[PDB]
Amino acid sequence: LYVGSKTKEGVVHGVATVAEKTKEQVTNVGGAVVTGVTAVAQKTVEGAGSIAAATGFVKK
Amino acid sequence: LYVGSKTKEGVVHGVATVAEKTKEQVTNVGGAVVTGVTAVAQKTVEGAGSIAAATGFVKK
Amino acid sequence: LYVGSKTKEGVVHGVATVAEKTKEQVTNVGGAVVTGVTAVAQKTVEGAGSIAAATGFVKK
Amino acid sequence: LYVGSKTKEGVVHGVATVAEKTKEQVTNVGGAVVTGVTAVAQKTVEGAGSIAAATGFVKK
Amino acid sequence: LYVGSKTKEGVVHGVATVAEKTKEQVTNVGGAVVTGVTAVAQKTVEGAGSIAAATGFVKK
Amino acid sequence: LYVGSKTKEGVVHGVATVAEKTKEQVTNVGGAVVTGVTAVAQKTVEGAGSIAAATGFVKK
Amino acid sequence: LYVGSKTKEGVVHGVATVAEKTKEQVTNVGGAVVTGVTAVAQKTVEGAGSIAAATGFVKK
Amino acid sequence: LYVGSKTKEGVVHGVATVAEKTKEQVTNVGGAVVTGVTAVAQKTVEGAGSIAAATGFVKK
Amino acid sequence: LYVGSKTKEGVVHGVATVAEKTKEQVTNVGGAVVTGVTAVAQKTVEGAGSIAAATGFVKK
Amino acid sequence: LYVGSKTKEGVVHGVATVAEKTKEQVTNVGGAVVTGVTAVAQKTVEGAGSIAAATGFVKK
């Protein structure tokens, strides 16, 4: 009870998912593909956190 | 009870998943493919964390 | 009770999965393929953690 | 009770999996293939941890 | 009770798996293939740990 | 295709159920108790069908 | 295609249910109790059908 | 294809169930108790069918 | 294909069940107790069928 | 193919069951007790079939 007796940081309680009929044709050449990432929690204190960061390339 | 008697950091409690009929034709050449990553928790304090980071390439 | 009597860091409690009929034709050339990674927990303190990081290549 | 009487770091409690009918034709040339990795826990303190890191190649 | 009377690091409690009918034709040339790795725990303190790291090649 | 090539009579396709925390104290004396009957199909042609018919008594 | 090539009579396609915290104290003496009957289909042609018919008694 | 090439009468396709924490104290004297009957199909043609019929008594 | 080439009468395809923590104190005197009957199919043509019929007594 | 080339009457295809921690104190005097009957199929043509019929007594 000095930083906290219950301390629940990255929380999603209850989800229910329906997805009946799906077609998905995916085609890349040089890029990446991320499709379904359904249930996710995240806490960062000082580090650079991210979720599903999409990027094509980096040239310098 | 000085950093915390219950301390639940990266939390998702209850999920239920329905996905009836699916077709998925995937084709790449040089890139990567990530499709389904359903139940995930994450805590970072100071390190750079990520989830499903999609990137195509890096040239320098 | 000084760092914490119950300390549950990377937590997902209860999931149920239905996936009835699936076709999946996958073809790559130079890239990698990650398809299904369903139940996952993660805590990093200072190290760079990741989940399902998709990348195509790196040239320098 | 000084680092913690119960200390449960990388935790997923209860999952149930249904997957009825599946076809999966996979073909690569130079890349790797990861298909199904269902139940996974992870804690890193300072080391760089990862799960299912997909990469195509690295040239320098 | 000074590092912890119960200390359960990489934990998945209870999973049940149904997978009725499956066809899987796999063909590579130079790359590797990982197909099904269902029940896995992991803790790293300082070493670089990984799970199912897919990579195509490395040239230098 | 004369009574019907696909003939799907009592049908519920896809449901997902979340119910997190429950207390239930039940007390009867002479009556019956029905609590949870979640997934149910029914077709009757000519017979008297029913679902969860609650009745206390019958005197004559 | 003479009574019907697809003939789907009692149909509910897709439902998702969230019910987080519940208390339920039930007490009867002579009557019946029906509480939760979530997913139900029904077709009757000529028979007397019913769903969750609540009745106290019948005297004659 | 004269009574029907596919004829699927009492059907529920896909359900997923989450129920985290439950207390249930049940006490009867003369009556019956039915608690959880989750996945059920039913077809009757001419017979009197029923599901979870709760009744207290019958006097004549 | 004259009564039906595929004829699937009492059908439930795919269910997944999560039920984490449960207490259940049951006490009767003269009545019966039915608690958990999860996966059930039923077809009756002309006979009187039933599922989990709860009744207290019958006097005549 | 005159009564049916595939004829699958009482069918449940795929179920997965999780039930982590359970206490169950049961006490009767004159009645019966049925607790867990998980996977069940049933077809009756003309006989009176039943599942888990709970009854307290019968006097005449």
From Swiss-Prot, chains A, B, C, D, E, F, G, H, I, J:
Outcome of substituting residue 20 to K: Increases oligomerization
Placement of Sequence repeats on the sequence: 5-19, 20-30
Subcellular location: Cytoplasm; Membrane; Nucleus; Synapse
Domain of life the protein comes from: Eukaryota
Modified residues annotated as Phosphoserine in this record: 50
Residue numbers binding Cu cation: 13
PTM annotation: Phosphorylated, predominantly on serine residues. Phosphorylation by CK1 appears to occur on residues distinct from the residue phosphorylated by other kinases.
UniProt effect for mutating residue 9 to K: In PARK1 and DLB; significant increase in binding to negatively charged phospholipid liposomes; increases oligomerization
Annotated consequence of substituting residue 13 to A: Impairs copper-binding
Region named 4 X 11 AA tandem repeats of [EGS]-K-T-K-[EQ]-[GQ]-V-X(4): 1-30
Tissue: Highly expressed in presynaptic terminals in the central nervous system. Expressed principally in brain.
Family: Belongs to the synuclein family.
Domain notes: The 'non A-beta component of Alzheimer disease amyloid plaque' domain (NAC domain) is involved in fibrils formation. The middle hydrophobic region forms the core of the filaments. The C-terminus may regulate aggregation and determine the diameter of the filaments.
Disease involvement: Genetic alterations of SNCA resulting in aberrant polymerization into fibrils, are associated with several neurodegenerative diseases (synucleinopathies). SNCA fibrillar aggregates represent the major non A-beta component of Alzheimer disease amyloid plaque, and a major component of Lewy body inclusions. They are also found within Lewy body (LB)-like intraneuronal inclusions, glial inclusions and axonal spheroids in neurodegeneration with brain iron accumulation type 1. Parkinson disease 1, autosomal dominant: A complex neurodegenerative disorder characterized by bradykinesia, resting tremor, muscular rigidity and postural instability. Additional features are characteristic postural abnormalities, dysautonomia, dystonic cramps, and dementia. The pathology of Parkinson disease involves the loss of dopaminergic neurons in the substantia nigra and the presence of Lewy bodies (intraneuronal accumulations of aggregated proteins), in surviving neurons in various areas of the brain.
Subunit structure: Soluble monomer. Homotetramer. A dynamic intracellular population of tetramers and monomers coexists normally and the tetramer plays an essential role in maintaining homeostasis. Interacts with UCHL1. Interacts with phospholipase D and histones. Interacts (via N-terminus) with synphilin-1/SNCAIP; this interaction promotes formation of SNCA inclusions in the cytoplasm. Interacts with CALM1. Interacts with STXBP1; this interaction controls SNCA self-replicating aggregation. Interacts with SNARE components VAMP2 and SNAP25; these interactions allows SNARE complex assembly and integrity.
Role summary: Neuronal protein that plays several roles in synaptic activity such as regulation of synaptic vesicle trafficking and subsequent neurotransmitter release. Participates as a monomer in synaptic vesicle exocytosis by enhancing vesicle priming, fusion and dilation of exocytotic fusion pores. Mechanistically, acts by increasing local Ca(2+) release from microdomains which is essential for the enhancement of ATP-induced exocytosis.
Name this protein carries in UniProt: Alpha-synuclein
Species: Homo sapiens
Annotated gene: SNCA
Parent-protein residues present: 38 to 97 of 140
